[PDB]
Ligand binder design. Structure first.
Ligand SMILES: [Fe+3]
Ligand SMILES: [Fe+3]
Ligand SMILES: [Fe+3]
Ligand SMILES: [Fe+3]
Ligand SMILES: [Mg+2]
Ligand SMILES: [Mg+2]
Ligand SMILES: [Mg+2]
Length: 309
């Protein structure tokens, strides 16, 4: 009785094993192989966060759970998930090619990053659509952003509330909430890219929902291209805010990220933690969504809303 649809789930991608680090970072760096010292540093970082293998598993579990939950909560469509990645196989084009091979003619896509940008989301969507056009007989409707889905806001609001509730009384009254996403080159401004505005809006919505009056917006994980990147960086922001007002606790909500990957487990849980430890403040960073039912229901709602269902 049901219509078949592809569910194209897109993400940055992560190495599968240590021996993938070289090719994965070469791809990120646009063909420039990391030097030996950098390769070694990267391996050490992954070791420090508990290893590589669990990383790509999260993305897989998110796609699987999303597929199953979508199929459970409505009776009109049967979805089949395909994963399409930017920096490692299966590439976006591979996923579209497989949908076509499997006889999918209608699909909906979503990127596992809640804010629209020209650099990432728009590029992924365009790439998916271009391959579908090349192959023919398959159309894709694409989710562009989802940071403002109420169920998603509620996820983080509730995690934040729990974190503040857990604090000793003196911290609860002298904390700062830092809401962040992956930095991008400032030059996206030239195109009117709403990415920064959307991060600020995520921050406002989460702080408001949680009843937190003192918060700030920062960026993290900037690449090394010569042109300026969006700032301030969370490490600098933390110290600046401390020097300015003396906060006893910092709560990090990397809302731009959806899982326990290197840019949270290392860029927050290590790099930010260095700074909080140095200044004598308490470090908190509530659970990432990962593949938890609350987050999966949020994504499901996003997809069904995009289809008018
Ligand atoms: Fe299942
Ligand atoms: Fe379910
Ligand atoms: Fe700002
Ligand atoms: Fe990055
Ligand atoms: Mg090995
Ligand atoms: Mg929208
Ligand atoms: Mg970095």
């Amino acid at each position: 009785s049901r219509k078949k649809m592809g569910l194209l789930v897109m993400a940055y991608g992560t190495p599968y094993k240590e021996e993938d680090i070289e090719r994965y970072y070469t791809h990120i760096r646009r063909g420039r192989k990391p030097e030996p010292e950098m390769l070694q540093d990267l391996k050490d970082r992954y070791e420090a966060i508990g290893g590589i293998s669990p990383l790509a598993q999260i993305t897989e579990q998110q796609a699987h759970n999303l597929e199953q939950h979508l199929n459970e909560i409505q009776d009109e469509i049967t979805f089949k998930a395909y994963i399409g990645l930017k920096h490692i196989e299966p590439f976006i084009e591979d996923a579209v090619a497989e949908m076509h091979k499997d006889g999918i003619t209608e699909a909906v896509s979503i990127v596992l990053a809640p804010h629209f940008s020209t650099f990432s989301v728009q590029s992924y969507n365009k790439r998916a659509k271009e391959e579908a056009e090349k192959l023919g007989g398959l159309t894709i409707t694409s989710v562009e952003s989802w940071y403002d889905e109420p169920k998603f806001v509620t996820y983080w609001v509730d995690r934040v509330k729990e974190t503040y509730a857990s604090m000793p009384e003196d911290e609860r009254e002298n904390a700062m909430l830092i809401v962040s996403a992956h930095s991008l080159p400032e030059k996206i401004k030239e195109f009117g890219d709403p990415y920064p505005d959307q991060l600020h809006e995520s921050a406002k919505l989460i702080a408001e929902g949680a009843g937190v009056s003192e918060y700030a917006v920062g960026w993290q994980s900037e690449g090394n291209t010569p042109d300026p990147w969006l700032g301030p960086d969370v490490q600098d922001l933390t110290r600046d805010l401390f020097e300015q007002k003396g906060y006893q606790a910092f709560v990090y909500v990397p809302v731009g990220f959806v899982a326990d990957h290197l840019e949270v487990l290392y860029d927050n849980d290590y790099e930010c933690k260095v700074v909080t430890d140095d200044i004598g403040a308490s470090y908190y960073r509530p659970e990432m969504p990962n593949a938890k039912p609350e987050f999966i229901d949020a994504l499901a709602t996003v997809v069904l809303k995009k289809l008018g269902r």
